[PDB]
Symmetry: D2
């Protein structure tokens, strides 16, 4: 009734799936082999059997190219000195390669505009989402009309505290910042200043940005 361990290859070029499967299976069963529950031979045969099935599935049925990408997982049971895969748990993902002829032109041309983009300031817009229990105001942040983050403003007297994050086009964290407000409406000040505020935000992991966006949005909902 307990969950079974799972053989997972992660992403691998299709030409390499067989040795990925074998190496992962050996790594997972290293202790079973040292303990004498299983022999090397047992594990090699189990991996070889699974590769034999995958070959028919990936190469003959799905027609995967050797330069495509696959990810495979399957659960297995080791008991009574025998390994059995549970094929009802087999999952296969496939990604098909975009021909270089199609990509390279685009990349080449784009690389010419790149040195500009590296430095050029990101322009964002905002729309009000609501207020918190404590009277903070929450805004959604957008990049080219699409939602990418959130901002939270705490009104003071002719100033305010601002904090927020965006996930795109690069993940940024705007740490608590105190700013003088020169506009009757906080709304007006947020509209004209959001891009300037983020021009000094810090670069972080996407995961961190996502957490902060979600925390802020949760305070209004």
């Amino acid at each position: 009734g307990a969950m079974l361990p799972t053989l997972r290859t992660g992403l691998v070029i299709a030409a390499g799936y067989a040795d990925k499967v074998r190496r992962v299976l050996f790594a997972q069963l290293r202790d079973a082999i040292k303990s004498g529950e299983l022999s090397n031979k047992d594990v090699a045969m189990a991996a070889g059997n699974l590769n034999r099935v995958l070959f028919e599935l990936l190469v003959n049925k799905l027609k995967a190219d050797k330069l495509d990408v696959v990810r495979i997982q399957i659960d297995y049971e080791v008991r009574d000195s025998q390994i059995q895969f549970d094929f009802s748990t087999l999952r296969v993902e496939l990604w098909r390669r975009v021909p270089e002829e199609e990509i390279a032109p685009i990349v080449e041309d784009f690389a010419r505009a790149a040195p500009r983009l590296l430095e050029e300031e990101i322009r964002f817009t905002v729309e009000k989402v609501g207020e918190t229990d404590v009277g903070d105001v929450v805004y959604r942040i957008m990049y080219r009309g699409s939602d990418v983050g959130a901002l939270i403003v705490t009104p003071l007297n002719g100033e305010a505290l601002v904090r927020g994050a965006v996930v795109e086009p690069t993940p940024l964290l705007l740490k608590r910042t105190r700013v003088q407000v020169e506009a009757d409406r906080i709304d007006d000040f947020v509209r004209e200043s959001v891009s300037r505020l983020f021009s000094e935000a810090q670069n972080v992991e996407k995961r961190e940005a996502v957490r902060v966006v979600n925390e802020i949005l949760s305070l209004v909902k």
Copy 2:
């Protein structure tokens, strides 16, 4: 020549964190030594990620569940990181929808047990003979070249060794059989599948190497 930032294969939704993590790993010594600040590296990765966003999401229309692999050279000058955009390479692989894959995977879940029951059927074709008179055969699976074997005739007996890469990598270790020299060809054609039903499961790279070693003996 320059260090290269390399992501390896990554799901597109995760490319930015991979870029950041790889760059920090590569420049950990330059930071520990004060040559660069944590901030310098974060900003470099951040700026690169911004550029990659426009490329991947706009120009290449990559979906977040696609796979990408990215590399670009960079230089560390005067405590600044500078990317060489003429070395920017991007690879893209587009996800096959579950609808196309799931039913097919489902079939093999069902057919796997009986598929494993069957001995793998191989066929052979003579390729040539070596300097010392060993006979070399190519091995095929469903008509396509997958391997090779080599047979050394002795007096009334013979040594056999070989490998196949597909449908699973198998190494046939040196095996001694009793057979008359003038029937070795008949022997190979009749018994290739039986010989390999007892071969060793190995890495593909090993089987690939053995097949090439064998074939090279009959190619001048």
Copy 3:
């Protein structure tokens, strides 16, 4: 700046395959483009591996079950890889014998289950006011600094949030508690463990960023 072959952490027994695999991966594009052959790369990795063997076994006296991390710069000249040995760096960690580790782990393993669910006790030390008048506290575990807490006094209420990195990373999200302003110090010293007993389990890196964000407001 030159490319750098880097192994990351690897058991000494396996450093050779790591060096080889990393070198091929880094030169994948130069091979494709005929700048180098597979033979050239394989041979370069092989020669480097031989040199590292001598250093590891003769000079560093590394055991095959020790851990190493190696790096060295290289360039490609006239279709041949050339290593720059002035940039060779090797780090080594020596295995603590299993015989010494196992009794300690085994004994502790017996108590682990009890310890698993038990409440973590924290203490605090007031740091002081921020510019706008929130109050920051350091959080300590067993007399050691592990986190920070920031309290924003309201009208008969206070907002509290914070984080600790040890003994496990926890994030206390924005929480509104009923407390009088003159009672805040006492409330915090009295309730910090209770508050964190229902904090969010997070990554250590998240908690670190939050602790630094908070302490920077008063440093």
Copy 4:
């Protein structure tokens, strides 16, 4: 019952064990989460609790430094939307850092000689093991007095085929090579030529060399 899944960190610097533990557990339980069998919260708490316990073991009991390396594994059972660790399966390995001050000077000195050490053929020695049933001669190969490989010699007529493999000081495969030599001179020939032969051997992965050595040694008797 069936063998349980195992949480394994691989090698990790001690200061990073908690996040490795958390990331691996999430990766392994991603499907249980997506299926509704477990929540993100369940997994986060399981990992956090384990990390809490590991903190006491690593930092206080084994007294690991943050810059040491550790590797941790423990089995766990998931069933009925509940994660339970089996602490009787907890295994921890520790490696203590060798101070830079101590290694750096050794490495720097060695690096002076490294280039001139590549102008040098690897010197192997051999010892005869025995003959195979068909009369091939098998030798063990040694480097620094230790067994690192094997060679097999098949006498022809005034000639011989030689092949073999070593795993140290770097993995090398000597492909079938035909050489001129009288049969009663093979021992002498092998002593005098093994190092010269391996100077042109193929560089391979360690496992490839191991397999050849074993297959050659298995033929003896």
